[PDB]
Amino acid sequence: RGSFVEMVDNLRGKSGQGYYVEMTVGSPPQTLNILVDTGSSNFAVGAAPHPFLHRYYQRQLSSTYRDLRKGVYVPYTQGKWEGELGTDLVSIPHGPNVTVRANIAAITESDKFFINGSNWEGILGLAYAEIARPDDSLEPFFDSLVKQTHVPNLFSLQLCGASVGGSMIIGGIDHSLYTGSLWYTPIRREWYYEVIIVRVEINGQDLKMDCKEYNYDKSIVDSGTTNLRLPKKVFEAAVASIKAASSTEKFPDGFWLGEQLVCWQAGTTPWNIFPVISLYLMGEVTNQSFRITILPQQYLRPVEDVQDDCYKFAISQSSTGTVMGAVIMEGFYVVFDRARKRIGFAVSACHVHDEFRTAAVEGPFVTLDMEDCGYN
Ligand SMILES: C[C@@]1(c2cc(NC(=O)c3ccc(C#N)cn3)ccc2F)CCOC(N)=N1
Ligand code: NA
Ligand code: NA
């Protein structure tokens, strides 16, 4: 409880490529780097010599592998994977000192899935059974962990943005990782980590949309997506406020659609011209909310593959609802308190800020009719 020094700093990554944790699978153990993803529910690992992979799971080496004799085919918007299901012993070296028999999907064919040049070779789907493929009787990793050990039913994430690293605390919260207080929002349904956004401000000016728009058709917290994604109508209104608040300079409008990069001379990006963005989330108590505030440092992402200082606009339009991706999460320490069905936010002790502004988590606020904000 409250102090897990062996787990601090157990995540790594590179800009644009996500945050991964070291895992071992099988007997004797095979070490793999595995992307941490709160937006999906399968533990799936490269199991064949795909040319982009540093390492892959070799079932034939594991004396503890058991075949489930069932294939899985998983298409996404961008690309797909398919593989073969089994179970094996899994452990997290910089994690609790336990071993668990978990489901693993051994990926034997994929397309647009692995990143050329990245250092991970599998994905740890940390969300619930309801979105597991092929169906909800395939128990997710973290459910197996809790069922089989005395690890408490919660984990927390601190993602430190730009090389990147962070911490995933399995079984607890580490208080040195955040400042001020944790504020909690209810998990509305256990499938994704679905939450309810009740109001949206751009430099403290309310968007004034019906709040049901903010959650059309859901809002989720997703470490496996880079951007803040917003439902289309909300995106349209948010950009229009961001441009106004910022029209102290004039950028190519393709910039706002994420279609072109913008660059300044190294040394001073003018952060001060860009507004803060606040999301009010449903609180624990009737008619009570709290608000989280992110900076341009979070939503303007450095792009490194080209001489000066180039950024991509990292808020984008969505058709799958609001996605609070690594753009939101890098401001906060986020607690996935599955035992009490709630998600905690606090200011991260590592978030990227300047001398004038920081990220913020503040409450309570009085917000009426917060249940009307959910979409059915
Ligand atoms: C399973 C699925 C997925 C996710 C990923 N993520 C990343 O590459 C990735 C890249 C950068 C960041 C950051 N900062 C986080 N994730 C790759 C394939 C992939 F299939 C589907 C889409 O959405 C979710 N969350 N997970
Ligand atoms: Na348990
Ligand atoms: Na603290």
Side-chain angles (χ1 to χ4, degrees):
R1 296 188 64 79
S3 189
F4 300 80
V5 63
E6 77 273 22
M7 293 184 254
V8 170
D9 207 30
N10 63 0
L11 297 185
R12 293 152 68 198
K14 297 183 90 293
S15 268
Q17 296 183 346
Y19 290 82
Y20 55 86
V21 67
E22 182 193 323
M23 290 185 90
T24 66
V25 182
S27 309
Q30 301 169 45
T31 304
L32 301 160
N33 286 333
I34 298 300
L35 173 82
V36 166
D37 184 12
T38 61
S40 68
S41 301
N42 279 85
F43 179 40
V45 310
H50 191 283
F52 305 169
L53 293 183
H54 292 84
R55 280 163 297 271
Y56 52 93
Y57 180 30
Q58 286 187 112
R59 288 168 289 168
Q60 74 273 8
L61 303 173
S62 182
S63 65
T64 43
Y65 182 71
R66 300 163 183 183
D67 204 325
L68 280 173
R69 299 96 125 89
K70 195 172 145 74
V72 55
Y73 179 100
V74 186
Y76 292 109
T77 330
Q78 180 133 224
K80 46 130 269 196
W81 54 271
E82 68 180 330
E84 300 169 2
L85 298 170
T87 68
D88 209 340
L89 296 183
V90 182
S91 167
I92 304 180
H94 304 288
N97 235 235
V98 298
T99 299
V100 136
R101 171 156 298 272
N103 287 318
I104 306 164
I107 295 168
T108 54
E109 181 181 341
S110 59
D111 161 87
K112 297 193 170 176
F113 175 76
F114 290 121
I115 300 171
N116 189 13
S118 80
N119 200 35
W120 57 265
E121 51 264 350
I123 296 195
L124 184 56
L126 293 167
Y128 296 98
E130 169 99 312
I131 62 168
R133 323 273 180 106
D135 61 70
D136 60 25
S137 72
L138 198 75
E139 180 173 287
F141 178 72
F142 203 87
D143 298 42
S144 300
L145 175 59
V146 175
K147 277 223 175 207
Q148 297 168 37
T149 71
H150 300 266
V151 181
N153 193 16
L154 96 168
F155 67 87
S156 54
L157 292 174
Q158 187 207 43
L159 306 184
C160 307
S163 252
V164 295
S167 296
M168 176 176 69
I169 309 303
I170 298 131
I173 286 170
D174 188 307
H175 310 289
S176 78
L177 296 183
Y178 66 93
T179 55
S181 188
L182 282 163
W183 279 86
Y184 294 93
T185 195
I187 290 163
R188 193 205 185 193
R189 186 189 155 188
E190 294 154 303
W191 59 326
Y192 304 89
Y193 289 106
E194 180 187 1
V195 301
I196 287 176
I197 286 166
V198 302
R199 184 177 158 104
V200 176
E201 285 172 351
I202 307 294
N203 263 0
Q205 321 232 30
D206 188 333
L207 279 190
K208 270 173 232 188
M209 294 186 70
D210 166 7
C211 65
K212 211 183 292 287
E213 306 287 350
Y214 307 134
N215 303 291
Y216 176 54
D217 62 298
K218 64 192 183 282
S219 301
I220 72 178
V221 178
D222 187 1
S223 63
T225 292
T226 296
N227 282 3
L228 180 56
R229 309 184 49 209
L230 298 171
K232 182 166 170 95
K233 249 180 219 174
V234 175
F235 184 69
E236 294 176 0
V239 157
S241 293
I242 304 174
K243 302 207 261 66
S246 202
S247 59
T248 49
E249 265 193 71
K250 192 69 187 169
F251 314 83
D253 288 87
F255 170 67
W256 302 110
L257 306 150
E259 279 170 356
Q260 252 164 48
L261 290 186
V262 64
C263 320
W264 299 265
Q265 149 160 244
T268 11
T269 290
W271 303 117
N272 330 19
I273 76 176
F274 285 103
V276 297
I277 299 170
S278 287
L279 302 176
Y280 291 66
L281 299 179
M282 181 181 279
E284 296 192 278
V285 169
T286 297
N287 287 342
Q288 167 266 317
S289 63
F290 60 98
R291 87 164 160 234
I292 64 176
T293 290
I294 59 161
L295 313 173
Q297 279 86 347
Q298 276 81 58
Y299 66 82
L300 294 212
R301 325 283 300 176
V303 183
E304 276 299 342
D305 50 284
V306 64
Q307 183 292 122
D308 267 319
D309 271 32
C310 299
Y311 296 92
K312 208 212 204 186
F313 187 53
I315 301 180
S316 66
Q317 59 191 358
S318 177
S319 50
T320 69
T322 297
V323 183
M324 296 162 73
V327 162
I328 301 284
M329 302 184 60
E330 296 177 358
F332 305 110
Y333 182 58
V334 185
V335 178
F336 298 76
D337 180 354
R338 297 158 51 99
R340 290 177 202 85
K341 280 189 79 172
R342 57 186 193 166
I343 294 168
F345 294 82
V347 175
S348 173
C350 76
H351 84 279
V352 174
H353 59 94
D354 53 46
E355 332 210 341
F356 309 75
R357 293 181 306 189
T358 63
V361 185
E362 302 179 312
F365 299 93
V366 186
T367 312
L368 277 27
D369 290 348
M370 280 189 307
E371 305 273 351
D372 297 336
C373 305
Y375 186 81
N376 303 315

